[PDB]
Design an enzyme around this catalytic site. Structure first.
Site, PDB file in Angstrom:
ATOM      1  N   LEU D  41      -9.709  -5.374  -0.865  1.00  0.00           N
ATOM      2  CA  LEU D  41      -8.337  -5.275  -0.404  1.00  0.00           C
ATOM      3  C   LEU D  41      -7.624  -4.127  -1.106  1.00  0.00           C
ATOM      4  O   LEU D  41      -8.228  -3.331  -1.831  1.00  0.00           O
ATOM      5  CB  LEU D  41      -7.604  -6.595  -0.627  1.00  0.00           C
ATOM      6  CG  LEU D  41      -8.109  -7.777   0.188  1.00  0.00           C
ATOM      7  CD1 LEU D  41      -7.358  -9.016  -0.212  1.00  0.00           C
ATOM      8  CD2 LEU D  41      -7.944  -7.501   1.661  1.00  0.00           C
ATOM      9  N   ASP D  42      -6.320  -4.042  -0.885  1.00  0.00           N
ATOM     10  CA  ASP D  42      -5.467  -3.003  -1.426  1.00  0.00           C
ATOM     11  C   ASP D  42      -4.441  -3.661  -2.340  1.00  0.00           C
ATOM     12  O   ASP D  42      -4.286  -4.883  -2.351  1.00  0.00           O
ATOM     13  CB  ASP D  42      -4.794  -2.225  -0.282  1.00  0.00           C
ATOM     14  CG  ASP D  42      -4.224  -0.892  -0.720  1.00  0.00           C
ATOM     15  OD1 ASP D  42      -4.305  -0.570  -1.920  1.00  0.00           O
ATOM     16  OD2 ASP D  42      -3.697  -0.162   0.143  1.00  0.00           O
TER      17      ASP D  42
END
Ligand SMILES: CCCCCCCCCCCCCCCCCC(=O)OC[C@H](COP(=O)([O-])OC[C@H](O)COP(=O)([O-])OC[C@H](COC(=O)CCCCCCCCCCCCCCCCC)OC(=O)CCCCCCCCCCCCCCCCC)OC(=O)CCCCCCCCCCCCCCCCC
Ligand SMILES: CCCCCCCCCCCCCCCCCC(=O)OC[C@H](COP(=O)([O-])OCC[N+](C)(C)C)OC(=O)CCCCCCCCCCCCCCCCC
Ligand SMILES: CCCCCCCCCCCCCCCCCC(=O)OC[C@H](COP(=O)([O-])OCC[N+](C)(C)C)OC(=O)CCCCCCCCCCCCCCCCC
Ligand SMILES: CCCCCCCCCCCCCCCCCC(=O)OC[C@H](COP(=O)(O)OCCN)OC(=O)CCCCCCCCCCCCCCCCC
Lengths: 459, 40, 100, 87, 128, 171, 177
Positions: D41-42
């Site tokens: 993810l970010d």
């Protein structure tokens, strides 16, 4: 009045012949008996004062001050027996002897029929008070507090001695009963102007007047608790009693000479109350509140209307009880946190709930909550000063805003908010402390049921 | 937490030849203890 | 080490050596008897009997009398056509004015 | 009012929110699945995950505490430590 | 573009709008690190006393004692009578006293002149 | 009881109950219940207490002060006479205060008992109140907190000089 | 500029805090959940437009004018959680958070009402006063010269030691007493 002077004197063998553990109990018990006996002074008449002898009398002005004076002594002995627990027995008996001697000087200060005997007892009340402040005070500044307390007072009162001896030589007598009937109108001259100032500035110092009040926030915060209680409760009211005696002689010059001393009061009660919005010290906040409340008594005496005198004597008795309770509450925190800083210990309703109820009641009587005699005196002074000048209600009403804004601020800072995390010696309230708060507040509340005994010689 | 009583810094204010030392009253040493001077 | 000195003692708790303390004295018997003295001669004697004494003061400064006497005098001068109060406190016949 | 939370209940609700997110596949999710390294993810996605936790449990996580919660178990332990669970 | 935020005395500038915040220079980072070190040292010195079981009392704060002594006991020794403090002490000390003196004097001269001419409605005034 | 002449009341004229509806009002039943449950036990207790009063009857008296010489016939700085004059004046001052209080009670009771037509139906009490307040203001107002018979005599002499000057200038 | 562990906020932390403040003030702006979800995806697209901007001066400039954008487009009454600072239930229960040392000031008659609780409290106090000197000598042998640099406390490094300065974290009051 010799049935009150001799028991107070006999408290000296009673404190010096007692056992080494019984000296607080014996003096408390017999001073409570003297305080019960003090109610026989309520034999007052609507025309004549209660005139005992050539030396002593008691009208309806001196009688509430006497009952408050003889009631304050057991309360001072209850407040003072905790921080003098490690004390030497001889110095403990000396402290109790200074309180007894101060009571003895006060109860024949207020009953002195003749004005130079009033002066001698009025200025004899310095020396036990000076010794109490400068000997059993806590900090370094108790010596400077004693110097300011002594040398504002004597600077004010040494002209008063000369003025009273002038009245003695001119009228022929300083009997207040003779001077009610031989009083002559004091005309407009410079001699009579400085006559007025010599008659008034001693009491202007001891009330205190604004501008001359600087001895008081030093003498209240540096005294011990019995000293703080006797300066708050009684020793400011010597000025009011002396003004109400001496303004008989100062007519009609007062009607143009009281103008600078009303302004100084009417603005000064705005200033000192404002000072109470920013005081970091709790005991200094109570001291500047005492200046703010006695400024109304100064205005009420200087305008010399009947409603003003009734409100001023009700306000003196009410402020005596209330300010004595406030200093006792501040002492109750100082005996736990050992600092008078008001922002130090916070949130104390979570820790001391019943003591916070006593704080709440004392703060409500500080802000003149009706039907307390605080509000009765406050209200009657405001009525008579509206009769004086209609604009004064501004300076009255604004003061009644600010008097709320430090009465509850002191309640919110000490008792509310989140408590201080790093203070953990906050003991539960001792029975001595709750007894002391109740013996201050319950007479103050019962006097709302019958205020006519604390409304002076002209009810 | 206890009562303040004076220390050496407070008590040495009362030990000079005078109480308020000025420029003139600065060389004044306090007098001897038995008030007896060396014969010089 | 300037001015040799006892170290400042710790804050003593009256509840530790006496959990039943009333705060009057470190001796518990003296403490309980000082509590009884304060509560009996403070509340049972000064406050209760003092409130009973002030409640039954014999006509304090004649304020009941002054009403009752007024209830006579109005009743005297309503019936005889007199006004209820004169503007003059004293008789104007017995006052010499300064001439002008 | 306000029924008490359990560790199993907080863990089930945190995984229940994270299975309703269209960047985390529910067949790969675990309590020890790191959001940046094990889920890919970010950091913006992690801010949105902590905001979903705040909307789920009704209280704010401060950012200095939010930027250190990088697996579901750290989120469950934070909500456990704040809500004072298993009394 | 946008109305620029004008900070005031009682509406300060936000942290996010201060241009001095977005400087990442090492001479302004060493100041932040030194402030964090001072704060960490005082925090450790506090909570080594706050968590002591032997301690039962008030943790003395020298900043609080120092603040109260600055507010109360160190005001007159730092005073110099000059043009600023004299023109502030006269304008605030005797100024409002002279103002309220003339206000109440004018009001009472007016009311006294109305009463002694009978031109003031004082019909039911018998309480004073 | 009291004296009906110093505290006057007009005769109460209550209207007879003329019920038009058939619904029984709760107030008659509550009046019957208040008479049966409350008024009769309180009446029995008061009759018992009244019998206990009647078993020992004793009296108190109204103190009569004889009229001593007033301040106008006292020598200047003669305290044994002007003391008695001052005490007489203070007692008469309290009595005049309570006369003003009695007339205020009459005015307020008239306003309440007349209700809405009180501005018409209380002109007599308003006139008596205006008279007694004008007399009290000419007698005791503006004396100050150190009021005395000397102050009141000086105010009376000033007012009588004003009256004599107004009589002389208008003749 | 103000953090407990670090002395500063990084650029990445500033961008993330702006992103979370922008989403919360956007949810305060636009109330309904579908319409918020639409504009939140638009705001996420606006943040992902300039995500891979390697120039730190240009990225700091974008952060600065995005703060200006946020300050013009904020909400006057943003949504605050109730126990979040500024909320309606925030610090409500602090008048019920009585500290534990008050239990030492109880009377033995009211300590005897809870026998097992105080018997179990005394072993916590014994644990604390037998772990205090070990954790103090853990701190003073690990703190460098000039005092500690950061506010981070070390954990317990041995088997049997408690973490240093643990008492007022473990024995803190509950949120709902
Ligand atoms: C001659 C016979 C006379 C008999 C009647 C008595 C006349 C008055 C005497 C004094 C009455 C008040 C005393 C109680 C308060 C102080 C103690 C206390 O903390 O109580 C809490 C405590 C109960 O609390 P708790 O749950 O057990 O624990 C405490 C909490 O932890 C913590 O507490 P808390 O937070 O729960 O409580 C705080 C709360 C706070 O509440 C308030 O502050 C709100 C109330 C005040 C403001 C609003 C009302 C203003 C005035 C209107 C009402 C009066 C006029 C009404 C008439 C019609 C209109 C004119 O306090 C109260 O509710 C106290 C109620 C009474 C308040 C009276 C006004 C004080 C305010 C300041 C001055 C105001 C003007 C003067 C009023 C004078 C009245 C005569 O009370 C007691 O245990 C009572 C003990 C026994 C008290 C005896 C009092 C009389 C003693 C006199 C002895 C000698 C004569 C013999 C007569 C004896 C009679 C039995
Ligand atoms: C608290 C700080 C401030 C203190 C202020 C104290 C009051 C201020 C005024 C005091 C004046 C001195 C006492 C006056 C007594 C008056 C008696 C009297 O009837 O006098 C009539 C007499 C008049 O003389 P006579 O009445 O004998 O004359 C016969 C009558 N005729 C006039 C018709 C001929 O007044 C005087 O003789 C002088 C009065 C003024 C005195 C001036 C000197 C003192 C100046 C002020 C000092 C104030 C305190 C200083 C200390 C401050 C702090 C260190
Ligand atoms: C005095 C100056 C110094 C100050 C300090 C004094 C310290 C020494 C203390 C000595 C003892 C105390 C002295 C003062 C005594 C005052 C009491 C007193 O005498 O009262 C006389 C007054 C006398 O009333 P009275 O004067 O109308 O009675 C007529 C006189 N007799 C009795 C002869 C017919 O007592 C009362 O009013 C008592 C009335 C009944 C008891 C109280 C009823 C009210 C209680 C509450 C009811 C509900 C209200 C709403 C509550 C809501 C919740 C808050
Ligand atoms: C702030 C510190 C603490 C408080 C300290 C005390 C403050 C209050 C006392 C001082 C206030 C000012 C002085 C009092 C003013 C009111 C009375 C007065 O003197 O009025 C000024 C007077 C007006 O003139 P006139 O009315 O003719 O007076 C002649 C009197 N036969 O004017 C004149 O006659 C002209 C001026 C004459 C000299 C005045 C100064 C010396 C005398 C007073 C001291």
């Amino acid at each position: 009045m010799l049935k009150y002077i001799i028991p107070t004197m006999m408290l000296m063998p009673l404190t010096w012949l007692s056992k080494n553990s019984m000296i607080w109990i014996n003096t408390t018990l017999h001073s409570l008996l003297i305080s019960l006996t003090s109610l026989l002074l309520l034999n007052q008449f609507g025309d004549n004062s209660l005139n005992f002898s050539l030396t002593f009398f008691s009208d309806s002005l001196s009688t509430p001050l006497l009952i408050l004076t003889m009631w304050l002594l057991p309360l001072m002995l209850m407040a003072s027996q905790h921080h003098l627990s490690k004390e030497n027995l001889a110095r403990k008996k000396l402290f109790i002897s200074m309180l007894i001697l101060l009571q003895l000087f006060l109860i024949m200060t207020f009953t002195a029929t003749e004005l130079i005997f009033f002066y001698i007892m009025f200025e004899a009340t310095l020396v036990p008070t000076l010794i109490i402040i400068t000997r059993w005070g806590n900090q370094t500044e108790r010596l400077n507090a004693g110097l300011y307390f002594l040398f504002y007072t004597l600077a004010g009162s040494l002209p008063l001695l000369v003025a009273l001896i002038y009245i003695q030589n001119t009228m022929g007598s300083l009997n207040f009963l003779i001077l009610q009937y031989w009083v002559q109108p004091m005309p407009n001259s410079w001699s009579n102007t400085f006559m007025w100032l010599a008659c008034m500035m001693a009491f202007m110092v001891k009330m205190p007047l604004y501008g001359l009040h600087l001895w008081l926030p030093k003498a209240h915060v540096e005294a011990p608790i019995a000293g703080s209680m006797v300066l708050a409760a009684i020793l400011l009211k010597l000025g009011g009693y002396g003004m109400m005696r001496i303004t008989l002689l100062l007519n009609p010059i007062t009607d143009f000479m009281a103008y600078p001393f009303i302004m100084l009061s009417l603005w000064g009660m705005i200033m000192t109350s404002s000072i109470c919005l920013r005081q970091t010290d709790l005991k200094s906040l109570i001291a500047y509140s005492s200046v703010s409340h006695m400024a109304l008594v100064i205005v009420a005496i200087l305008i010399q209307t009947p409603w003003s005198y009734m409100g001023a004597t009700a306000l003196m008795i009410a402020h005596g009880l209330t300010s004595s309770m406030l200093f006792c509450l501040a002492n109750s925190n100082y005996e736990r946190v050992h600092s008078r800083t008001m922002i130090l210990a916070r949130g104390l309703q979570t820790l001391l709930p019943l003591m916070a109820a006593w704080w709440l009641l004392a703060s409500l009587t500080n802000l003149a909550l009706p039907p307390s005699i605080n509000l009765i005196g406050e209200l009657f002074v405001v009525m008579s000063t509206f009769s004086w000048s209609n604009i004064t209600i501004i300076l009255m009403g604004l003061n009644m805003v600010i008097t709320a804004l430090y009465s509850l601020y002191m309640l919110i800072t000490t008792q509310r908010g989140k408590h201080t995390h790093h203070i953990n010696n906050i003991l539960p309230s001792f029975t001595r402390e709750n007894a002391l708060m109740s013996l201050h507040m319950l007479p103050l509340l019962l006097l709302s049921l019958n205020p006519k005994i604390i409304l002076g010689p002209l009810y | 937490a206890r009562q303040w009583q004076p220390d050496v810094e407070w008590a040495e204010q009362y030990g000079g030849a005078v109480m308020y030392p000025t420029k003139e009253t600065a060389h004044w040493k306090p007098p001897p203890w038995n008030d007896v001077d060396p014969p010089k | 080490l300037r001015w040799q000195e006892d170290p400042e003692p710790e804050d003593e708790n009256l509840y530790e050596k006496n959990p039943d303390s009333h705060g009057y004295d470190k001796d518990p018997a003296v403490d309980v008897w000082n509590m009884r003295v304060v509560f009996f001669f403070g509340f049972s004697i000064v406050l209760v009997l003092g409130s009973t004494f002030v409640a039954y003061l014999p006509d304090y400064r004649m304020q009941e009398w002054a009403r009752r006497e007024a209830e006579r005098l109005v009743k005297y001068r309503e019936a005889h056509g007199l006004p209820l109060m004169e503007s003059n406190c004293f008789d104007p016949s017995k006052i010499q004015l300064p001439e002008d | 009012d306000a029924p008490p939370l359990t560790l199993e209940g907080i863990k089930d609700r945190v995984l229940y929110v994270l299975k309703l997110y269209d960047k985390i596949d529910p067949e790969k999710l675990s309590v020890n699945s790191h959001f940046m390294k094990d889920l890919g993810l970010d950091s913006l996605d992690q801010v949105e995950i902590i905001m979903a936790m705040e909307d789920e449990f009704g209280f704010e996580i401060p950012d200095i505490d939010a930027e250190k919660l990088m697996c579901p178990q750290e989120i469950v332990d934070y909500i456990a430590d704040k809500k004072d669970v298993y009394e | 573009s946008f109305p620029k935020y004008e900070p005031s005395r009682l509406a300060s500038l936000p942290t996010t709008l201060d241009p001095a915040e977005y400087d990442i220079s090492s001479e302004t980072r060493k100041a932040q690190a030194e402030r964090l070190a001072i704060r960490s040292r005082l925090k450790r010195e506090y909570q080594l006393q706050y968590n002591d079981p032997s301690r039962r009392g008030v943790v003395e704060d020298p900043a609080l004692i120092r603040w109260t002594c600055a507010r109360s006991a160190n005001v007159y020794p730092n005073f110099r009578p000059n043009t600023k403090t004299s023109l502030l002490g006269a304008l605030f000390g005797i100024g409002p006293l002279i103002f309220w003196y003339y206000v109440f004097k004018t009001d009472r001269d007016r009311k006294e002149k109305l009463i002694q001419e009978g031109k003031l409605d004082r019909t039911f005034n018998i309480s004073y | 009881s009291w004296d009906k002449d110093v505290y006057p009341e007009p005769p109460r004229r209550t209207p007879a109950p003329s019920p038009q509806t058939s619904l029984p009002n709760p107030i008659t039943y509550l009046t019957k219940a208040f008479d049966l449950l409350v008024d009769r036990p309180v009446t029995l207790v008061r009759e018992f207490i009244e019998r206990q009063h009647a078993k020992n009857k004793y009296y108190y008296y109204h103190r009569e002060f004889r009229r001593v010489p007033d301040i106008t016939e006292c020598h200047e700085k003669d305290v044994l006479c002007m003391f008695e004059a001052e005490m007489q004046w203070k007692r008469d001052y309290k009595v005049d205060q309570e006369i003003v209080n009695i007339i205020q009670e009459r005015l307020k009771a008239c306003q309440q008992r007349e209700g809405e037509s009180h501005r018409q139906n209380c002109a007599k009490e308003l006139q008596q109140f205006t008279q007694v307040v004008k007399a009290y203001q000419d007698r005791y107002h503006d004396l100050g907190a150190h009021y005395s018979a000397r102050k009141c005599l000086a105010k009376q002499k000033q007012r009588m000089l004003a009256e004599r000057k107004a009589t002389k200038e208008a003749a | 500029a103000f953090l407990p562990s670090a002395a500063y906020l990084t650029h990445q932390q500033k961008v993330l805090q702006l992103y979370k403040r922008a989403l919360r003030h956007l949810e305060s702006r636009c109330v309904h959940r579908d319409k918020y979800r639409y504009f939140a995806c638009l705001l996420r697209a606006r943040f992902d437009e300039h995500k891979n901007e390697k120039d730190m001066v240009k990225a700091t400039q974008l952060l600065r004018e995005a703060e200006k954008e946020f300050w013009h487009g904020q909400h006057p009454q943003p949504y605050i959680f109730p126990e979040s600072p500024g909320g309606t239930s925030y610090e409500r229960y602090e008048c019920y958070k009585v500290p534990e040392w008050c239990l030492d000031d109880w009377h033995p008659s009211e300590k005897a009402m809870y026998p097992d609780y105080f018997a179990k409290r005394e072993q916590w106090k014994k644990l604390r006063r037998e772990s205090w000197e070990r954790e103090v000598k853990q701190l003073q042998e690990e703190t460098p010269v000039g005092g500690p640099r950061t506010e981070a406390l070390p954990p317990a490094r041995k088997q049997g030691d408690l973490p240093p300065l643990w008492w007022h974290i473990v024995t803190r009051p509950r949120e709902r007493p």
